[PDB]
C-alpha cells in the first residue's frame, strides 16, 4: 500500500506578447519584481499544473486579483550580453533563490513560494530568450517521505477548500484542538498532526513540487514529528488524503525547479516575435495580401510567384525606368537592377518619378535603387553606373569600353527579363543582341512626343528587323525613339504600364491552341497615340537580313565576339 | 585761355559674380585686403575711366599682373547687420580712409592711391549691397588750381608713357637737371618744375580726381612752389600738357570718392544674383525650358501658360491621386490640393506612388502635398483632411459632417479643374453636384481590376446620367468603380495619364467646326481594357432624370441646400 511521494512541476509558463513588449519598453527606457494572479479553479482537464500567466502588467504594482485568485510574487533578471545569459550557473542561480525562499519560509511558511525568470532580449531581431524557474528546495536532501492513501473525507476537503479560497495569501493550513482550520503553527501541528497544502498540480496522486518546500520547513520546525497526515487540497475533485511518515536515506539541500522547454528539455525557451512586432515584416505581409486577396476574389488562376521571382534588369533609369520600376514593384517584383550612366539633373524630378530636388548631381542609377528601398525596404534594388556604347560612333577608350561590354553581359545574364528603356535606336543594338545571344525576354519601350511603342523580342521579329516609323510619316510621329525624352508626360506613364502589364500576361501559361493567358492577350507590339487616344497591336516576323537577330549576325558575334562587336559599333 | 582744373571719377567698378561668390564662401567660413590689376591701355572709347575689375581673386595674395598692368591695393569692409551698413557715416568713413592715404602719401607720394568697398551680403536671398569708394583728398580745401593749355610735346609724352609702363608701381614722375624722367623728389621738382601724372581718365581735358591727391602731397612738400607744369599722361592720345598755378580761395581737407550707382545717384548698389546662384531658381528654370523647348521644336501652337495656371483640386490621394498629381506636375501645374481622409498604410507605398515606408500611419492628404514639395520645392501643394459623405448612408454627427459639406465647397470653388478620384459610386455624388452647381470642369477616373473609365462633366452627360457598367456584364468588368482599388497596377497608371492628358487637350482652344485642338481630340469618355490592350471612346447625352445633373435636382439643391443634400444622402 505504501510508496514514496513523487512530485510534478508546480507551474507552466504562458508569456504573452505584451510581456515581451513591456520588457523591451523597459530596456530602452538589473532585477525586476513581477506579480501574477493564479487561478486554481480555472484548470483545463488537459494541463498538469496551474498556468502562470505573464503579461505587460506582471511588471506592475497594482494588479487586481479576482475573488479566489492567489497573488504570487516573482522576479525577472535581464541580461544585456547574450553570452552572460548562456554562461550563467543555472544551478547556482536556482540555489541562490531557493535559499532566499528558505530564509522567508523559516519565518512564515507561507512565503517560501515564488518564481523567477532569466532572460536576454534581442530587440533588433525581436528574439527573446527566457527560462522560468520555480525554487523548490528539499532539506535535508536525504529525508524522503513514505506515504499511504486514506479514503476521502469530502467533508474535511470542502472545509480546506473554502479556507484557502478565503485566505488567499496562505499555502498551508492545519487543525486546532477543536478541529478547525487555522494558520500553520509549529506547536499546534506538533500535536494535531494534520497539514493541508494548497496544491497547484492536477497530476493524479502527484502533488506540486512545491510540497517539498513546506515539508522542509515542517521538518525544521518540528524535528521530532515523524508521523502526520498530509492533505493535498485541489479546487475540484482530486484532493486526496495521505498517511505520512518521514524516512531518511543516508544539512544538505537539493534544489530543482527549472521549466522544461517546448521541445521537452531542460533549457531556455526562445520566442521570435518579429513576424508580429517588426513593422517592416508586418508591412511586407500586407503588400503580399493585397495581391493574394486580389487573386483570391477576382482571378484565382493568376500566378503570382512567377512574377514575384522574376529578376528584372532595367536599362535606363529615366522617365521610363522610374515608371516601370514602380509598376513592377506593385506586381510583387523584388529583384530590380538599374543601369544608367547619367546623374540626376534639375529638370528630372518633375518628370522621372523616382528623384527629388535634394538628390541632384548625384549618380542617377544608384539613386533609383536607393529610392525603391525607401518605398519598400525589402526590395533587392541595385544601381550600376554603366554606359551602353552606340552604333555609328567612333570607339573611345576601347579598354574601358570593352569592360563596359563585358559588364553589360554579366548583367543581361544574371537576370530573367530585360527592359530596354533607352533614348535612341543607337543604344538599343548592343543590348538587344546580347540579350538574344543569352536567351532573355526583351521588352522595348520607345517614346515619341505624341505616341509610344512597346514590344517584345523572340519566330517573332525584333526592334531592328523592320523599321518602326516610315519617312513619309507624320512630323509628330517620326519623333518616336528619336532621342525624344521630353514628350507629353502622359506618354511615358502609358508606355511604362503597358510594358509591365505585357510582361505579366506574357509570364503566364498560354492556353493550348490560342495566344492568350489568364491575364489576356500577349501582343508582339503595342502602339498608342495620344492625339486621338488609340492603340494598335501589330505583329511582325523575324526579318532575314536584320542587323541584329539575323542568323548571319548571331554567327558573327558567336565566332568573333568583341572584334565583331567593335567593328559593328564604328561602322557608319 | 585760363580755367580751373575740373576732375572726373578715377575708376568704374565691375564686380563679377565670382567676386560675390568668394565673398560668401568667406562669410560662412571684418576687413579684407583686395588687389586688382589695372590696364590703362585697354580702354573702350565708350568709358570715362579705367575699369576696376573685381573677381574671386582680388581677395587673393598672388594675382598675376600682365606686362604694363598697374597693381592697386584695396580693401572691403563687410557688415553682418544690414542696419549697420545703412547707418554708417559714409562721410566719416571715406574721411577716415583719405587720412590713411594722406599718411602714406607724405611718406611716398606713390602710395596715396587706393579703393575701398563697404558691403552687406544677404546670403539667403542672394542679394548683395556694396559701395565702391576711391579716397580723393584735397588739402587745403581752399587751394584750387588755375590752368592753361600748352601745345603737345608728343616727344615728352612718349617719354613718360614708356616710363610709366615700366615703373608699374609709380603714379608720379618728374624731370631731373638733365631732363630725364625720374621718381618724384621734392627738392628736385622744386627746381625742375614739372610733374607728370599717370591719369586714369579718358574724359577729354579732365584728369582723374586722383590728381587732387598728388597735388595735395605736392603742396605739402613744396609750400613755395606755386607755378609749375602739369602733364596728364594717358596710354593713347589724350595726354595733355598744362601750365599750372596754385590759387587759394578763403589745414582743411575735403574728401570725395564714392561711386555713383547704376541709376546715377550717390548711393549703394544692390545686385540680386538669385536667378544665377539659387539652385532652387536654376532648377525651376530648367523645368520651364523642358516645356518651352518641347513646344518650340515640336508644337509651337501649344499653350503652356493655360495649363500652368490651372489650379487643380484632387479628391483622393490614393493610387490615382499620386499618379495624377505626378503627371500634372510634369505639365507645369503649380497649384495642387489633395483631399483625403485616410492615413498612409503599410500596403500603400508600393502602390500609391507618393509615399514611403517611413511615413506610415501619418495623415495621408497632408503627406502627399509634402511629397510633391520634395520633388519640386516651388509647388504650391496642400493637403486637407476632409471626408466626403456617401449616398445611402445614415448621417453621423450631422454637425461636423455639415462643416465637411461646407469646406468641400470652398475647395471646389477656389479651384479650376476638379479631379474625382474616389473608390465607389457613392463618393462621387456630392462632389459631382457641387462641382456642377459651381461651374467647374470635372474629370472622373474609375478603376476596375481589368479596365478603367475616364470622363468629363459638362449638353454632355455626367457620371450619374446613365450607368457605366451593365449587370449582364463580365465578372472582371463589373468590378469598375466598385470600391476596387487593388487591381492590376497598370490600370491606375493608364487611367491617370489619360485623365491628365484629356485635361490638357481639353484646356486648349477648339478649332471652329471640329471637336479637336492642337493636342488632339477631346473625348467625353475613354475606356481601356488590359486583357486585350484596347481603348474605346464613347459619348453620352445628359439624361433628363439623372439624380445628379438633372434640372429638377439642381433646382432642389438651389432652393433648399443642405436640407436637400442631407435627405439625399440618407435616402436608400
Ligand atoms: Zn507556537
Ligand atoms: Zn531583327
Ligand atoms: Zn630731396
Ligand atoms: Zn447626369
Swiss-Prot record, chains A, B:
One of its GO terms (cellular component) is mitochondrion. InterPro entries: Atg7 (IPR006285), Atg7_N (IPR032197), Atg7_N_1 (IPR042522), Atg7_N_2 (IPR042523), ThiF/MoeB/HesA (IPR045886), ThiF_NAD_FAD-bd (IPR000594), Ubiquitin-activating_enz (IPR035985). The keyword Protein transport applies. Changing residue 501 to R: Impaired homodimerization and ATP-binding. The active site is at residue 484. It holds the Pfam family ATG7_N. Changing residue 527 to A: Loss of interaction with ATG8. Transmembrane segments: none annotated. A motif (GXGXXG motif) lies at residues 316-321. Its main location: cytoplasm. Belongs to the ATG7 family. This is Ubiquitin-like modifier-activating enzyme ATG7. It comes from Saccharomyces cerevisiae (strain ATCC 204508 / S288c) (Baker's yeast). The lineage of its organism: Eukaryota, Fungi, Dikarya, Ascomycota, Saccharomycotina.
